[model samples]
Target chain A: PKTIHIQDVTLRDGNQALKRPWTIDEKIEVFDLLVELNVDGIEVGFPSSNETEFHTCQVLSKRAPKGKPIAALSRANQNEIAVTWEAIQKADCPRMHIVYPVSDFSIKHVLKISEKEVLQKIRNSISFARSIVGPGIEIQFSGEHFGDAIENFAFTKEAFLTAIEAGANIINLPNTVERYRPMVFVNMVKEIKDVVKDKAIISIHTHNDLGMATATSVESVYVGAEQIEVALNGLGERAGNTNLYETAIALHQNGENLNINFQRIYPTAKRISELTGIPIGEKTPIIGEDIFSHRSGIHQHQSKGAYRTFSPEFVGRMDKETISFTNQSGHKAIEFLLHQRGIQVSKEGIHHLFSLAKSISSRENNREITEAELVALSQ
Target chain B: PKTIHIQDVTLRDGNQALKRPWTIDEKIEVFDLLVELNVDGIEVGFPSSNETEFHTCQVLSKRAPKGKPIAALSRANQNEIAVTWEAIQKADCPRMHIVYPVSDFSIKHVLKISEKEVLQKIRNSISFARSIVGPGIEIQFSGEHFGDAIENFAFTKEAFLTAIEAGANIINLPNTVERYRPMVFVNMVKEIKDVVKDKAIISIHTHNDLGMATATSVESVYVGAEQIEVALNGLGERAGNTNLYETAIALHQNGENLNINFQRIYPTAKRISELTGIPIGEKTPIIGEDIFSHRSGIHQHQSKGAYRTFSPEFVGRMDKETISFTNQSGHKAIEFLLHQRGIQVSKEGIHHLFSLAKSISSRENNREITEAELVALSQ
Candidate 1:
């Protein structure tokens, strides 16, 4: 029903959460994927926070999608904003996304500033950011503790309007702490929507503390919010951010009503997950290796009988695109994948393959067999 | 602030999602652990669904909680309920928890009944179930798809009232599909609470689709639901159910104002995680292994300066335990643990251990070392 802007944050918010550092080459590969995926924008990174990350952002800006803006993350201070702005200034489409915490805890402890000062900081930083970036550049105001700000509804809403009025094209109501359920945050977004009138694009940046990051992101859109800033695989601090794969494809699958094009969501997610070395949890929401695969007998039976839950063709998704011979391979779905690869087998042959797969999986501690291992199994 | 009943549903709802089958011994072990965890009740399994699971449920009942109830799952049908009832008939506290899908899709596909017929079935099932168990027995009705049911307000209210009128003491409304954000469901629970008017205890059976099961369960109490049906490590169908450990500890942490006891939450969760091979996600909230472990440089710096963000002691209900290590005994931390075990580490020994561990870790994919693997590395 509404146009949704998918803002990829894999290069920015995603890198911060990486257990091991990602190479510049890895960032470019992900950026190329995001560009191909046609995401609205990419939050390159907070260049001011780390020099190396900043350079990565700058290098990314030089080669990133020209049409899709590359934004940078920053706190409210002019110094942070200026540094971040420098990193993205060379981009064809550069944006400044500035954040100032609106929660009592953030005001009292994190910044050690009073409410008046926090708002002043927001106003000053936003104004300064807009001035440097000049007209036509995208400016986003990130109200850091907007979820908590809901408890202090009036100040939060006023602050939201203030940011929008002061040249913020996109207003991000962040679920910063990741503590509450999505509805709690969504209700706040709903309340914000009541008056905000969708005048400015509403983008949600959710954390995975409670693990509803993707669900909340989708709900934010359902309740009329437009933009979603998500890290691939929901990679970020704590549990992580909203998973791009789940949000994008879910919206796409249900798109007759939802109306969002999320082509390449699966491919993009896989590359990001692989690059990050975050082995997609077998149970990770949508892009999880197992989400498209059914293991239960009843589900397997129902799946064969007809379309049971989600259809693989719905997103052109595959559970195991590469089938390795294994004792445990059985006549499971892989048989079909292998059949396409010019392999054929009878029930007994399939049974032996299943056994082989099982032995390797068991020996390898449930990990997928590599090409070498697979060849050995086949032999 | 209120005395509440927390039911354990690992074997029933938790096992339902698994593709693999659990051995009889595993079920008994889980049942015994549930009793040890001090859960008020345990859903052994759905006997009418599968013969193997039915026998396993019966085996579990043999060593289940003495005074605490052992609940068996069933569909709201004569054969289904009868089979489940027969399986756990000898339990110390036997409860036949009849669960039926209430969503529209379920109505069309699963029940294939009109609204009136569904209501009639509810009344008949509860009446017959009460009669079968007699006066002291507990009759519970689970209104599946309670979230969707609540959206269609009148239908859900009527369903709850019918169950209560027909001898249902506990009405467990499941957030079956973890599709929407938390508050949407929490508000639905609140509406049910007000409408129920203390007629029966309100319980929540929530699933973790987006990984927010625990947060949703915690907020369910915030919105006035009292009883919680949880599975260890948040195991359940699909993404799984509300994590018992996470919700318990989160409530405990917030209970000072919220009035919840979180003392035993961590230990109980650890026991379950260790026993189940569930390997709770590293980012799993509250009770996850890394909840207290700091990795971020800024976080480490801030935490070191003034224990910002979180104090491990406060979150885990104990003193903050700092573990600093280097490899080669490698790290100082390993040597400390070794010294505690009276195993002195020589410099060369530590160096050898570090290189070998690194080699083994790198040689293996995912690189996470198991205890036996680590010993092999030492060798």
Candidate 2:
């Protein structure tokens, strides 16, 4: 009965690192698409970054449909949070998503601040943010780079309690830089979720530095992550954020009632790919070109029973399964295709055809055998 | 202190489903490459499928080096199992890899056999093969689609016991069609591993139907799987089997001492891509072209802190991280590149140039503002 809030950060986290940051109109268009897709929240952009960003957030916040919140990310500091608030303060359901590096690695190296100072920054900023943003407007606070924050558990724990007390009920932990196994971070999520279970909603924000973002986020939900922060196309730097479609399908497949629409999964992926100009590769996991394909004999034969987790239609793909003949293709696939084409062959004929087809595919660099080629070979 | 035996299935399972199954010489060449790559076992092919496969397995078995084993796959049928053993019997270290469907859905549907009959098949086949191959040659048995076998755990458990009593000690559980989450299959692995802990070395064979094969296989190791059956490019039908590098790096990151070479990962990936004629994509986990690139300003800046799980050299890529300048590039990234190119600009100059670069990239369709462009902007 657990329903997850998919706070899709396609515009902010996904946008922030794209080669060409989308124009205001393009981002707003993406916002409308995600809203129509029923995302619980759309992190529009870092409103505090520029005048254009601030205006886009204000426009997007107003444009968002009822029940769909628009989020604006900001720094933990005062001015950025103020700009963030000023942008989305008048929206129907607005969120002030504040982020600050809380890990020992980040604090020591990047921020050059002490543990006490880091905790105090969260206490001071959220109280300041909560005061300006006011009640009813949800304040989501992220402890940036929480992937390695386990070493500084006492301070990280205190920071979470302080954020909750200061009205950040949505407590996010970001794998800002994925350095280790998914379990290492999943264990960290469990540790903090165990402590902050009563006070706040533990949100998961994972990066794909190690390509484990979807896995890391999916496993985090099983422990206690109520909100999964994801990006369309998993767009960002190095390896981008946790892919929205990948994580959504994973969560959906795990039997969790997801907030996003399943049918819009492929449409949204294509839309994002169009907007970003990044090609979703043939092997791009759930949404890949070859993901739903069946080219092997054993697979083509067993596909009806269990070669796929679900049918291609489950994710809103309009086409049927792409079952092509390769050297690896089985008799069932050829028979199925041949039968569908009304050119049924006997078992002995099929055995001969299968061997010949396998031989041809071998000679032709193992490419897919077309219906015409098969029929010609049959003749 | 747990070391996983990596059974690379590139030749057998991977090659089986390719458009053109590799020629005998090609399969032998691949076997030699994986031998140098130090995989514990190489699944040669489904030997009983054809004369080419049977001869290729014979060649690959002989080509295998000291301590490296070559595996030949077969079904539970007497002819296929006998063909499987005859092909691999003369090798230094050979495995007769026999597989059968044990799930209720598979047995009732695809297999069209009763639970009792399926169990008897394993007992009869493995015992028959053992008597021919004699003692000391490894016999690996896979319960074809263990992803759904948990629904029939009692029958599955009994089948494992039957195989063990019949002299098959290597028990492989394939997520034949990865329908659900990683934990679902991981739990299934744990369930059977718990039962077969004393008698067998549990092997995990996961498909990338959900794009979670790496995650599923990596987690399985923690529970009880001693071997991870993988392929170089995740090559197979549908989304392919688990990528060897992805799973190896994941397990290696999780602190599991794996039975494969770290330095040879990129070499093998490219080698397989060449042999298979499939491009190693930009987003291919661990081995992708863009996996080591840092484009976003924050990522480029913080990459030194921990943007990656490990440096490129850790996987044997003899190159530094690729940091490109996009609109998302921070001043630090631009400044670093400028300094690297022996161009120095003041703080004010850099900030002005940064804003100008951002503005130009926005106008220029959000493309990467290169070094020359940045230098021009500085002027």
Candidate 3:
């Protein structure tokens, strides 16, 4: 089995969701959380973006624990590379993430630079970063807008080859702005992987514009992407990035070789959502409240751990199975809930509870009957 | 190009999302809305479940306009099929959906029957429903827990063949509880389709347990499942079902033969969400607020319509693009927003606004700097 490297970008990409900047202390808190979860690496922040950001990266790089490298984001400019290096140089294993826009539209319009100049820029930036940090340091080349650029395969391949030749250790294929189906993206990853062929570690960074980020990220791994860049709760700019909880649990369930701390999944997700004030969707995969709660009658009668694709315990989530009573809930749900509460009820008693729960659920517009309500109805 | 049948199940599946029962009047309002949207079929309700449900199905069946069938849900039992037939008999195009568990676990435990008994149940149910509905009405066999049963390929194929042999016109493969990767589910749909080999029309009904319902539903279409069962705003028992807006928009963008009114997409989605009291996620694909909103500076400078997978106008939403100014917003975003407001600013003015917007965004935790705020800043 191939090992999938998980990289948390909540501090960098997810921070885009905040209207204000996270304080250094707050950044440290999240950085610590990522460390505790044992992610392979983290994109701390873009040091060249602002002075405060530069200082934060410098401080966090110094504070990050050994083995988990602290990575800084930068543009494909010599000056930005210098600053990125300044920030991360003190870390045990530092990564300089140099990004360049390679899409035809971005090249001709956004950057107003020729494709030849773009390739030269990729080579120069990596050369500069490699020279600054020496051959031992990790360098990641993120071909920004690679999703669209891949359609112009010749140009994208040139950019990737240039980055690989420039002493870069990882080739980051970012969806930048997710534009295609997950399968399409996966095929692109496969195409790029075949081109790179062990020359560099293939990393995937996807956006959720199409709401296929999680699927795309998982599919990329299946297609030989060694690294996945993700955010907690799928938080990021616009529609956000691939979510950590979903992708991690998905890989674990699918039997991928990953060392993620499965138990800290929900608690950490809650912390990040609370800290950022970004409310988790009630239906968000894995971390959502109702993910394990079965309300439908058909699901209520399932054998334990048989209904879901994977047991919730697999992710260290203790709430493996729950029965939420609603109009859709059958007598089985009522019995299941009552049994969980250690309250014994006969078949007729369970039937009475089911009717009461259904009526209450219907009147309430289909909300789940609370445990308190269920207990009262049993009385 | 193949014809993809879009089946709306909001009234039946989404109804479970309500705490109180929707009044007959409310159901009519939604039913009419669906008819106006021009779906091929609508799963009205479970007529045998309750007297109110039976009456609602009956009234709606009579009121349904031509070309669109009103479908009623039922168990594989004779009584449920009889009640279902009674409710939908008056429709111009009537459909009876007969469901039974076929997974080994469900068969052995939930149904407490042998594999032979399960196959017999599927055959008997479809035969009974076909007998009552006659040759004119559509008979749909929903193999509940089909996702799990597909793992036992031989049994699942046998069960489906039995349903087809018993006069079932449509084979409905429900994710029942979404498990496995979308590719896995899509592959399963292809496997089942190969087994049936044009003997029956294949349909897909998926849940959002892992948040891949929309992707799986779309991939099912790619693999030759003729029908997609969806709910508005993705409201259902727990995590909800495949969303109509996302699925429809996806097919339309990919160039499919779905004749759904593209313009009514957002308005109807908003209406259903409002009626159901289920709020749409800010980041939901296609119909989400942020799907069209550009926050990162890289996105703002892009050529018009280059970022999003599909134009909002394709879905009848006029707010095609929005600039959400935060710390991630660059000078281009400032320039874009000012230009939108018909105010041309000098480079210095743009720089000043960018600084202010950055500061405000940082302090506000990355909240989007609103148009009013931009106007104020310009002043």
Candidate 4:
């Protein structure tokens, strides 16, 4: 079993993209959910941005339990690192989460510097962060736009190794744009993880631009990446981050060792969505509202043995298996749904009810009938 | 380039779980979009369902172009296969797509029949259908619950091979519940593909119960599966099927050759969601309304060259790049969003607007400001 750490970015990466950013109190509410889910690391917010943000970080940092780091975001610059550390240092375990672009495009277009000079910057930045936060506090250095930096893998390697040598404990690599396939990203992660060995924990932080973030995270882990950074409901900029709800379930099912409270999965997703004002799609993976529901006659009939992992109670959803009483539903759905309500209908009654229900469902454009409607019709 | 065929199951698998099934005219509307997108095969609906469904399948079958098969689903039973073929046989290229479980749990619990007897049923079902539709028509045999049948790989293999020998032209393997990871399914697809080796087109149909459907499809294709089954918006049982929008873009990016009108993606997702009453999440990968939007300071600053594939125009979305003007947004958002409206402001003006916008955004709990509202404030 591969031991792992789950770092949730719902607050840092996720909050940055919301239409309405969460209030300090609202963030605390989300923070509580994260704690409930037992996430190994909590990335609180970008504290160097503003006074309010800095204040929120300090508050959340104080609230985090012992040994559970509250990671705060910063650019790989001296001032922001100092400010970021100053805010989060009050936590039992505070992490100065610093990021910088190593891609040639970013270095040339964004920073306009030589490759050697950029490597020097990472060394100075991570060393500077360690100087401010000291050896007791952890520092996470992220190589931003890692997918773009794939062409210059050697430079990316040296830069990450430099950060690690400069006292970074977590070497975070982000598929910042997600241009390629999962294997492309997964292969990069393995190469980095292999080089780093036990010197530092290799963190896989990915975007979903090509919709392979979840896949990349899982594959990266399979190849021995130690930490997977995710957001509840996969929230972030442009296709969002790797989904926590889905990824956690996938890792657990695939026989990987992860320590998340699986029962809190749905509640965590619900609360995150509620606070973020992002509507959860009915078809969204894992935490979808109707994920346990069946409709087609064949699907409804085999649904008893159809589950790979449909423990509604496991995910904190009280509502068990739901069968939509549409015109296409099976007889088993009718029998099961009615029987759950303590109503017993004979075969003759079921036959007559099926005809009447089918007629009403078709008449209403094959609209779904609830148990209440079905029970009333049964009466 | 690896040649491939894209088969969309939005009408058959997707609409079956929908709250209100699409009307016959609405099916025509969706069928037209499918033609515009140039999907090689379209699984229209389960025609053996009812009179209305049988009518819808017949109507869409006639609408499909020559050489593009309109597939209608049926169980591995004689009567349903006959009904399915009768409705779909009018198309330029019609397919009787039949399914049966190979899982031990399903075989014992649902059918309570011998495994050998199940294989005979598939042979009888396909041979009987071929006799009815003759050589002019096609037949697809899906090994339902392929994931669950992994323990009995030999049986699953024999049943599919039996169908092919009995006249099934396409072999679809559905990961009916998606309990496992992408690689597990990928390996299974490769084993079958390596064995079949052009005897039939290996179709990979998967669900998103574990959120690896898109990854599984892409990985399956890499391992030589010829047809990829998808649904627009990933609508289907449980967490839904692999999304057509995401899968197409992923396949194209990963260098698989499959013809699809990429520009029609957003519009098709929009139309399907509108008809299905399934709201596309704002953070949905690729087809999301806000997937192209950026808000953080670093993201906004890098937006000029930060695109992996954010061509909104390429996806039929006219709202090219959106930046939510909130307290967390960068100065670039205020500058760019305003500049797009033919309004220019001095640096000093920008400085002042930033303060005012930040002030209002914070005062209103970081609510977003539109371009018009910002322009009004600029005055």
| TM-score of each model, in listed order | 0.76, 0.87, 0.86, 0.87
| Tens-digit lDDT track of model 4 for B1-379 | 6778999998888888876768888878988999999988899998877888898998888888988988998887888888888898889888789998887777877779999999999899999989898986778999888877766788888888999999999899888888867887888888888778878888889988888888888888878888899988888877888889888988887666778999999888888888888888777778777887776654223574675465777778886554556544446678887788888899888878877776787777765666777789997
Chain B TM-score per candidate, please.
0.76, 0.85, 0.85, 0.85
Better of 2 and 3 by DockQ: 2
Error at B375, model 2, angstroms: 13
Candidate 3 residue runs with Cα over 4 Å from true position: A108-114, A298-305, A310-379, B298-304, B316-379
Mark the regions of model 4 whose C-alpha exceeds 4 Å error after superposition: A298-302, A320-379, B108-114, B298-301, B320-379
Those runs of model 2 whose alpha carbons end farther than 4 Å from true positions after fitting are A298-302, A320-379, B298-302, B320-379
lDDT for A9 (candidate 4): 93
Q: Candidate 1 lDDT, tens digit per residue, B208-236?
A: 65455676787778777778888876666
Candidate that beats the other on lDDT, 2 or 3, i.e. the better one: 3
A84-193 per-residue lDDT for model 4 (tens digits): 88899899988889999988778877888899999899999999998887778778999988877856788888999999999999999888887767887888888888
Please list the C-alpha lDDT of all candidates, in the order they appear: 0.70, 0.79, 0.80, 0.83
Task: Report the C-alpha displacement of residue A105, candidate 1, in angstroms.
Answer: 2.9
Worst lDDT 10-window in candidate 2 chain A: A296-305
Candidate 3 has a TM-score of 0.86
Cα miss at A329, model 4 (Å)? Answer: 6.4
Quote the positional error of residue A229 for candidate 3 in Å. 1.1
Among all candidates shown, the one with the greatest DockQ:
4
In Å, residue B231's CA in model 1 sits off its true spot by 1.9
C-alpha-based local distance difference test score of model 4: 0.83
